[PDB]
Design a protein around this nucleic acid. Structure first.
Ligand code: ZN
Length: 601
DNA sequence: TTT
């Protein structure tokens, strides 16, 4: 166990300056801020920890204020002495999720530079699916060392202490150990990270630079109108009441809108085919099947849809408004997805209905501040463009090249008719095929998504591959090397290890092969999106225009732009995104603006 | 992910 003998507690300036001096000449050093809250914008710095060498670490408490806390260097004094080191881009720091720490220092007007290594990201890039990338997991997996957990020194549940309440020495064991271990983790992973140029390229030029940019995005937050959401909520309550009646009115008596219990004894008991509908879900939905004619399942279907939306966004969002900023600050997770795409939580921006009227009403709540407008810059069907590239298909590429709708272009080729005549059903069919390929779906699954018989769908796929051969090759070639080397790469070098690529298991291995085909396109989209964020943020930081990047969701970047700078800014954002990222994939950036996110979306 |  870690005792009080392992690390020093710095309580005097002289000792701090001595450490600063050593830190200044160290090649790299681990750094971490201790605070009184997870909420970055409102958190107060409570202490700082540093590790200069394995086994050599210190904790500097500055704002522990429990009853009779011993004297500590003051926060302002510690920070003024540390500021130079922290803002020196030449002083390289190592840390665990430095995005957090960068933000905390930003509450004090300090701009952390030299953000060179993040062990969370080192781990993530080495093998995204190896397991969780939190430090407790990393310490165990890479060093067979069990770190003191936050719950171990602070407690659990509502009665969990905030770090400033923890005794100086106990706080030190926890924080200094974290610093020491972070440096050790770095010393083990960094050498590994260079066994391959692809992962190294992604780590160095994409993930690390993105660290401060995500901090800025999160800290900027988004402006949401609580009234709009509340009115939406009141309304949904009403509609839910109306819908519950129309359900009672279509049938007899009352009942819960829970199928396989009350519904099955209604819907089919009043004729229909016995199978219900799993809310398994996005492949088998008999409720909406019947919905095309049977009125009850259609209302049950919408009832649930609004119920989920209301309790997830309409009633939640307003409560996420931060009292200190009056804005909402989503949590971006940079090391969680298997493919490399950023994920978002509280709120989860990506689960807000795109093609739905209610989803749009939610986005109407994301408003621009006075004299500003919301600007949306989206990469039009980037993953389809990436496949065209990865497939080297002159046909798909040409379609994009002449600005034609690729779904109608594809239909014209598969069904063999003039582009102008392609019907909605045919476009819908080519669309299902195209997106089916990205997820590497089978002819049978496609049949289930287009409601056509098996082999009929296979008939369509054979025609597709015949008209677009380069796609089948890519797929065969990608499933191939996947088994050859156990992983697939993105254009930049990002890797997705596929352990079950030879699982001798049924589904599990089928899943691995699908991931093999998809990852390279979805992963390349992610690298492209991150590189865009980095390029735009660099311009923002350098030119200092009147714009804030406020969100990243799916394939779009969202901003607040001063109403009088819109055109010059829209132009610049547009050029940076489709011309200052990768030059090999045919990219198209759609830019829109409006008073709210829906207007610009 | 961080405190
Ligand atoms: Zn352009």
């Amino acid at each position: 166990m870690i005792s009080y003998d392992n690390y020093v507690t710095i309580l005097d300036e002289e000792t701090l300056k001595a450490w600063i001096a050593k830190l200044e000449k160290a090649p790299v050093f681990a750094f971490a801020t201790a605070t009184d809250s997870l909420d970055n914008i409102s958190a107060n710095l409570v202490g700082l920890s540093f590790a200069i060498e394995p086994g050599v670490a210190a904790y500097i408490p500055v704002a522990h204020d429990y009853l009779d806390a011993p004297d500590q260097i003051s926060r302002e004094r510690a920070l003024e002495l540390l500021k130079p080191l922290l803002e020196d881009e030449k002083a390289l720091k190592v840390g665990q999720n430095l995005k957090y720490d960068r933000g905390i220092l930003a509450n004090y007007g300090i701009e952390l530079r030299g953000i060179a290594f993040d062990t969370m990201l080192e781990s993530y890039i080495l093998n995204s699916v190896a397991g969780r990338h939190d430090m407790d997991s990393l310490a165990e997996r890479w060093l067979k060392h069990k770190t003191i957990t936050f719950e171990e020194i602070a407690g659990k549940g509502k009665n969990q202490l905030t770090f400033n309440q923890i005794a100086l020495e106990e706080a030190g064991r926890y924080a200094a150990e974290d610093a020491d271990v972070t440096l050790q983790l770095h010393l083990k992973m960094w050498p590994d990270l260079q066994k391959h140029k692809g992962p190294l390229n992604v780590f160095e030029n994409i993930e690390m630079p993105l660290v401060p940019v995500l901090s800025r995005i999160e800290r900027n937050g988004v402006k949401i109108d609580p009234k709009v959401l509340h009115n939406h909520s009141e309304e949904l309550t009403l509609r839910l009441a109306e819908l519950e009646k129309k359900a009672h009115e279509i049938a007899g008596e009352e009942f819960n809108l829970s199928s396989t219990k009350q519904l099955q004894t209604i819907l089919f008991e009043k004729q229909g085919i016995k199978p219900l509908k799993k809310t398994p879900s996005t492949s088998e939905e008999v409720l909406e099947e019947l919905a095309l004619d049977y009125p009850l399942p259609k209302v049950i279907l919408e009832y649930r849809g609004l119920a989920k939306l209301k309790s997830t966004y309409t009633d939640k969002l307003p409560l996420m408004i931060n009292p200190k900023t009056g804005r909402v600050h989503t949590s971006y997770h940079q090391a969680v997805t298997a493919t490399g795409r950023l994920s978002s939580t509280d709120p989860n921006l990506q689960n807000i209905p795109v093609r739905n009227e209610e989803g749009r009403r939610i986005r109407q709540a994301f408003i621009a501040p006075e004299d500003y407008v919301i600007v949306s810059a989206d990469y039009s069907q980037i993953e389809l463009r990436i496949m065209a590239h990865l497939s080297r298909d002159k046909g798909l590429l040409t379609a994009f090249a002449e600005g034609k709708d690729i779904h109608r272009a594809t239909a014209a080729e598969v069904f063999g008719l003039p582009l102008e005549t392609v019907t909605s059903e045919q476009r819908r069919s080519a669309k299902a095929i195209n997106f089916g390929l990205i997820y590497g779906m089978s002819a049978f699954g496609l049949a289930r998504q287009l409601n056509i018989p098996r082999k009929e769908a296979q008939k369509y796929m054979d025609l597709y591959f015949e008209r677009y051969p380069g796609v089948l090759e890519y797929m065969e070639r990608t499933r191939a090397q996947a088994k050859e080397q156990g992983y697939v790469e993105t254009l930049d070098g990002r890797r997705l290890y596929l352990p079950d690529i030879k699982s001798s298991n049924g589904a599990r291995r089928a899943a691995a092969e699908r991931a093999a085909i998809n990852a390279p396109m979805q992963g390349t989209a992610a690298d492209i999106i991150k590189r865009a964020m980095i390029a735009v943020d660099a311009w923002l930081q350098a030119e200092q225009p009147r714009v804030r990047m406020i969100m990243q969701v799916h394939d779009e970047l969202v901003f607040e732009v001063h109403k009088d700078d819109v055109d010059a800014v829209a132009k610049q954002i547009h050029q940076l995104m489709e011309n200052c990222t990768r030059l090999d994939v045919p990219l198209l950036v759609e830019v829109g603006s409006g008073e709210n996110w829906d207007q610009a979306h």
